[PDB]
Structure formats: C-alpha cells, structure tokens
Homo-oligomer: A and B are copies of this chain.
Amino acid sequence: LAPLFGLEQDRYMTAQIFELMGIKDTHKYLLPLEQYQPPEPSPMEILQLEMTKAQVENVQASSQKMIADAFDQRERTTFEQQKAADELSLRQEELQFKQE
C-alpha cells in the first residue's frame, strides 16, 4: 500500500494528529506542501551513475575488441594465403627461368 501512501497522505495524517494534540504545525520546520520544492540530488549518486556507465562502456568495448581481433586474425590468415599464392607464382617463374 506504500505506492498509494505518498507524501501528502502522510503529511495530512501527521497534521490531523497534531490538530488533535498541537494545533499550529506551520510554526516550525514542517512546511505546507504547496511550497515544498523537491530535494536537490547530491553528487554521490551522480558520480556512481557515471562510474556504472563507464564500467558498462568498458564491458561493451571489450566485447567489440573480441570480434575486432577475430576479424584481424581472419584477415591475417587471408594475407597468408595470398603470400602462399605469390610464392607459388614465384616458383613457377623460377621454373620458367630454369627451363629457359
């Protein structure tokens, strides 16, 4: 039932209790909800959110670096096959030279 028992309902309950016991409730710290501005968040949760964001971003960066190095190895194997083909062509050229 807390999702419905917001702030204004609790304030009205406490105010009714006071009226039953002490009438003037505005005389002190307690403020009429009409002029109660919301609290100003602190830098702690802000920097905590920033740290969590940086951590998840580093996680995604590592995840992408994995596939990056995978593609790098694939391209390196392709280049090695290319070098093998070039060496075969050079072998054929040397055969032509020897036969001439």
Chain A residues within 8 Å of B, Cβ to Cβ:
1, 3-16, 27-33, 36, 38-39, 43-45, 47-77, 79-84, 86-91, 93-98, 100
Contacts and interface: CB of A to CB of B under 8 A. Distances in A.
State the number of copies, please.
3
Contacts of A61: 62-67
Nearest to A61: B66
Label chain A's interface by main secondary structure. helix
A4 B28 contact: no
A53 to B, nearest CB: 7
Nearest to A79: B80
A86 to B, nearest CB: 6
A84 B75 CA distance: 13
